[PDB]
Curated annotation (Swiss-Prot):
Other facts: Lysozyme C is capable of both hydrolysis and transglycosylation; it also shows a slight esterase activity. It acts rapidly on both peptide-substituted and unsubstituted peptidoglycan, and slowly on chitin oligosaccharides.
Function: Lysozymes have primarily a bacteriolytic function; those in tissues and body fluids are associated with the monocyte-macrophage system and enhance the activity of immunoagents. Has bacteriolytic activity against M.luteus.
PROSITE patterns in UniProt: GLYCOSYL_HYDROL_F22_1, GLYCOSYL_HYDROL_F22_2
Top-level taxonomic group: Eukaryota
Gene source species: Gallus gallus (Chicken)
Lineage, uppermost ranks: Eukaryota, Metazoa, Chordata, Craniata, Vertebrata
InterPro entries xref list: Glyco_hydro_22 (IPR001916), Glyco_hydro_22_CS (IPR019799), Glyco_hydro_22_lys (IPR000974), Lysozyme-like_dom_sf (IPR023346)
Molecular function in Gene Ontology: beta-N-acetylglucosaminidase activity; identical protein binding; lysozyme activity
Family classification: Belongs to the glycosyl hydrolase 22 family.
Protein name: Lysozyme C
Reactions catalysed according to its record: Hydrolysis of (1->4)-beta-linkages between N-acetylmuramic acid and N-acetyl-D-glucosamine residues in a peptidoglycan and between N-acetyl-D-glucosamine residues in chitodextrins
Length: 129
């Protein structure tokens, strides 16, 4: 599914991401825009052979099992294909584990490089939430 901006913001609020670990909703919408262009089906291979999956581009090295990333972990205890669903629950629940692991949203390269230190509230402007 390709979400609209405000549709995704509402879904992420319904799932408890607004101010989760102190990150306002606009941070999560901004990260999703630049990680996946709001597309739940997005996949991208990494140089080390791992793959990123879904709206928040969650990595198979640590977080999910895709059957082809040797020596990797599965800390969210899910198949990576679950992260491509039109239902974002699995992606959100795994992202909550990632953002809580000590490095906050710096785990998402695109967030650090394109959202951190910008007016992230712009990403939810106009939306009925
Ligand atoms: Cl959803
Ligand atoms: Cl933090
Ligand atoms: Na915000
Ligand atoms: Na894995």
């Amino acid at each position: 599914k390709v979400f609209g901006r405000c549709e995704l913001a509402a879904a992420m609020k319904r799932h408890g991401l607004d101010n989760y670990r102190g990150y306002s909703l606009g941070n999560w919408v901004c990260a999703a825009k630049f990680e996946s262009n709001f597309n739940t089906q997005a996949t991208n291979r990494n140089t080390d052979g791992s793959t990123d999956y879904g709206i928040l581009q969650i990595n198979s090295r640590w977080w999910c099992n895709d059957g082809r990333t040797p020596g990797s972990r599965n800390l969210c205890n899910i198949p990576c294909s679950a992260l491509l669903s039109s239902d974002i629950t699995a992606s959100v629940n795994c992202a909550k584990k990632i953002v809580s692991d000590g490095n906050g949203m710096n785990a998402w390269v695109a967030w650090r490089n394109r959202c951190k230190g910008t007016d992230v509230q712009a990403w939810i402007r106009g939306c009925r939430l």
